[PDB]
Design a binder for this molecule. Structure first.
Ligand SMILES: *[C@@H]1O[C@H](CO)[C@@H](O[C@@H]2O[C@H](CO)[C@@H](O[C@@H]3O[C@H](CO)[C@@H](O)[C@H](O[C@H]4O[C@H](CO)[C@@H](O)[C@H](O)[C@@H]4O)[C@@H]3O)[C@H](O)[C@H]2NC(C)=O)[C@H](O)[C@H]1NC(C)=O
Ligand SMILES: *[C@@H]1O[C@H](CO)[C@@H](O[C@@H]2O[C@H](CO)[C@@H](O[C@@H]3O[C@H](CO)[C@@H](O)[C@H](O[C@H]4O[C@H](CO)[C@@H](O)[C@H](O)[C@@H]4O)[C@@H]3O)[C@H](O)[C@H]2NC(C)=O)[C@H](O)[C@H]1NC(C)=O
Ligand SMILES: *[C@@H]1O[C@H](CO)[C@@H](O[C@@H]2O[C@H](CO)[C@@H](O)[C@H](O)[C@H]2NC(C)=O)[C@H](O)[C@H]1NC(C)=O
Ligand SMILES: OC[C@H]1O[C@H](OC[C@H]2O[C@H](O)[C@H](O)[C@@H](O)[C@@H]2O)[C@H](O)[C@@H](O)[C@H]1O
Ligand SMILES: OC[C@H]1O[C@H](OC[C@H]2O[C@H](O)[C@H](O)[C@@H](O)[C@@H]2O)[C@H](O)[C@@H](O)[C@H]1O
Ligand SMILES: *[C@@H]1O[C@H](CO)[C@@H](O)[C@H](O)[C@H]1NC(C)=O
Ligand SMILES: *[C@@H]1O[C@H](CO)[C@@H](O)[C@H](O)[C@H]1NC(C)=O
Ligand SMILES: *[C@@H]1O[C@H](CO)[C@@H](O)[C@H](O)[C@H]1NC(C)=O
Lengths: 395, 394
């Protein structure tokens, strides 16, 4: 979407995976979907270095709305969970140097059953803009046809544009066309800053594998369409929660960087381990994700339960991820000819290789004809950055 | 099996899940299947308190033997990787106060392709006993018929007995019987100290779930057959490796205790986190697994992506495990009437409840009519011990 936004993948925090649709503030006030939850996350995004690392969008997902629209046909924030309203929340978030995301649905209801935006696109867009909303995640539940789906996504895009406010537009458009209708990504990209292609992530390694396998399976269709202003969205980072081993967390962080994915954490910033914090704030890995060239990576090869992915970067550099998909045994040796990497230009005549994950380590100079040996933990990933030696010497 | 062994579930260490069939001592000397690997694990089993916690059997799995039998038809320790032989290794292990486990296969080959024991049951049994072997894991690969399968497991059982040496007998009989017909567990119990029922575990939450779901689905067939001398074997503990979140590791430890499972760790004792060590060595959880009554637990109820399991213990006590199977969101509250637990006798007229996992905490006294509320992490388990107040006052 040509709105000057998402020139690199959007980074922030989104409540959904970790907090879901918890409406019980009586029994669980510290985990219910409430203004207090978001104000606390906003404070910690500043104080715990998240904003500094690049995470700037504090985003509300489903279940913020009151059951009905007001007498002027406007969406309402829930009166008891958001008693001070969205505007005051937006002001609070802005005072921290952060941006606010909100959620709506193209159909008659949100996925959780609250008011949908169909028939109210213009009113809702103007409502969000006036509040100072900076991002909209627009979901595709409760839509009677694919024609109405597409039209609704386009209408809301134009309506947001007409407000004159810069608002990141995140769409679930192509997801709802799966598996029989092939999305027109040229069209989707014209209207959206990012788009969900695949089913919801959850707190499991199985879901991460499924997203990676569906991405690589469809990579010819989707990789080249991504770029500054329009990204493939493989869903939230779930690092720091309950269902992932350390190696699986490393794999998600590495691969979301390779995929030029928007980076929306869904976790509890009040209760997150130092290790998970350090991984999510990894300066070098975020720099790969945020690479200005904005070319999405891809799976180069797979076999013997190993996967090699790579991403072209600015300065003729490359990021390379090697995944051990064998879920038994110990750290497993993997050897690759560097000549196979980066279309055969990355290490011609030579490259300098730095390992970034699971630990940072300068590996040295590798000539065009040489081989690279790594040991990779089961379900883990080794992430490397390759610099072509001619680029290095030249200023 | 009535050999006086495995009166409580066997505890030890087994190489397979972590080290597999690594034969490359040239490129990977620290992880190849070699005498040095087992000697190092033996030292650490003592020095790091594993033996003291109850882990006493140091077990060799597949890929210890040479490609061929010797001219006397004996299995041979691989000459490059076990140059000093198994006898010397057994002597070394015994000197540490530990017991040695070894591996063979009922069919023509082991699963990795090494010589199988078919046609050699007596020779192999005598070979093992002479060496000082204390446990045999007997796998079911490359067996052409169900008759040869059953007869082979029976033959080896009797052959080990005939040596006069006490040897724990671990069988894959029901597992290899399953793809064809329901096993006869009465017969299996007669011949085996423990038996593998289900597919191999690996370093994944997926495999743990599959084992639990298979066990709970088939619990009517298998729970009551287990007891002192003969246990259901849901495979190795994989805590301390690569593929499990902390919550998933807690779940495995808790449920292997509920299930009265043999506890064979498969991990690298040279490189194990303090957290994983403390869980695997948890004295209260091990005491549940090792409960002298030896009655296997079971799934009590299931629904709303929660599972409740319980195990009767000696002295009118109960272990209760609550699993959160919802793999999204946060810690989820689960409430149960205590009158539903322990067939309604656990907390009549009251019980004292202590949480053991994920952290140890006394919860208090609960009347028969009361409800217990717990918050459980996604893929995690809360493990409780219930003590009846009648028993406490006595
Ligand atoms: C509503 O829709 C309209 C029409 O699509 C949209 O107008 C577009 O806005 C973008 C972004 O502001 C314009 O793109 C800019 O064009 C100018 C002149 O060519 C450039 O100088 C800009 O360069 C930026 O990006 C560079 C890197 O690529 C940076 O180095 C530099 O610093 C600049 O930031 C940029 O390319 C685009 O021209 C218009 N399109 C048209 C046809 O008018 C408008 O923004 C939308 N409004 C809202 C509120 O959404
Ligand atoms: C080869 O197979 C034979 C026959 O299957 C097997 O002989 C059996 O050994 C067991 C265990 O030693 C015997 O059971 C014991 O019998 C004695 C005497 O009657 C009892 O004292 C024991 O009672 C309990 O008390 C012990 C407390 O110290 C406990 O340790 C024990 O587990 C009991 O709870 C016990 O019942 C059994 O009598 C024989 N069976 C026959 C038919 O002789 C033999 O052990 C096998 N040999 C090898 C080397 O494996
Ligand atoms: C996918 O959508 C794009 C954009 O709507 C289509 O490309 C346009 O095609 C129309 C004619 O139908 C032309 O007027 C425009 O010039 C095209 N725009 C661009 C930017 O290419 C494209 O035809 C669609 N692809 C398919 C196969 O349906
Ligand atoms: O309600 C917010 C939710 O909306 C979308 O997901 C809808 C449903 O998708 C799957 O069926 C999933 O199993 C359910 O949990 C969920 O209700 C959206 O894709 C999500 O990201 C989220 O915003
Ligand atoms: O070779 C030792 C091994 O033997 C048995 O497992 C054989 C194979 O079973 C499955 O196909 C599995 O996927 C493989 O990893 C495995 O090699 C036995 O059940 C194992 O415990 C182990 O002893
Ligand atoms: C919403 O419901 C109305 C009335 O049933 C229907 O006409 C309309 O097409 C629906 N909108 C969508 C996008 O499903
Ligand atoms: C082993 O192979 C021989 C020769 O093919 C065969 O007679 C025998 O039945 C096999 N044994 C088993 C148990 O598979
Ligand atoms: C199991 O085998 C035993 C022989 O040890 C036999 O007595 C028994 O009838 C079998 N069980 C059933 C119910 O088929």
């Amino acid at each position: 979407l040509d709105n000057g936004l998402a020139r690199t993948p959007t980074m922030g925090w989104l409540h959904w995976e970790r907090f879901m649709c918890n409406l019980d503030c009586q029994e669980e006030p510290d985990s219910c979907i409430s203004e207090k939850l978001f104000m606390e996350m906003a404070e910690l995004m500043v104080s715990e270095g998240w904003k500094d690392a690049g995470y700037e969008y504090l985003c509300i997902d489903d279940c913020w709305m009151a059951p009905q629209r007001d007498s002027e046909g406007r969406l309402q924030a829930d009166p008891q969970r958001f008693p001070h309203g969205i505007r005051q929340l937006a002001n609070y978030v802005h005072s921290k140097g952060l941006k606010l995301g909100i959620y709506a649905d193209v159909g008659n209801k949100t996925c959780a059953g609250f008011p949908g935006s169909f028939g109210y696109y213009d009113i809702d867009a103007q409502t969000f803009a006036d509040w100072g909303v900076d991002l909209l995640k627009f979901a595709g539940c409760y839509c009677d046809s694919l024609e109405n789906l597409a039209d609704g996504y386009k209408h809301m895009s134009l309506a947001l544009n007409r407000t004159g406010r810069s608002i990141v537009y995140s769409c679930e458009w192509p997801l709802y066309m799966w598996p029989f209708q092939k999305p027109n990504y040229t069209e989707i990209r014209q209207y959206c800053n990012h788009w969900r292609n695949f089913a919801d992530i959850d707190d499991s390694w199985k879901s991460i594998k499924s997203i990676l396998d569906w991405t690589s399976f469809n990579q010819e269709r989707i990789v080249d369409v991504a770029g500054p202003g329009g990204w493939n969205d493989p869903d939230m980072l779930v690092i720091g929660n309950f269902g992932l081993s350390w190696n699986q967390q490393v794999t998600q962080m590495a691969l979301w960087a390779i995929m030029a994915a928007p980076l929306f954490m869904s976790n509890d910033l009040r209760h997150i381990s130092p290790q998970a914090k350090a991984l999510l704030q990894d300066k070098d890995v975020i720099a790969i994700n945020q690479d200005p060239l904005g070319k999405q990576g891809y799976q180069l090869r797979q076999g013997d339960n190993f996967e090699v992915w790579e991403r072209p970067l600015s300065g003729l550099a490359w990021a390379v991820a090697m995944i051990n998909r064998q879920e038994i045994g110990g750290p497993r040796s993997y050897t690759i000819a560097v000549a196979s990497l980066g279309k055969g230009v990355a290490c011609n005549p030579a490259c300098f290789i730095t390992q970034l994950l699971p630990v940072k380590r300068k590996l040295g100079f590798y000539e065009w004809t040489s081989r690279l040996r790594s040991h990779i933990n089961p379900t883990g990933t080794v992430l490397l950055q390759l610099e072509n030696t001619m680029q290095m010497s030249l200023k």
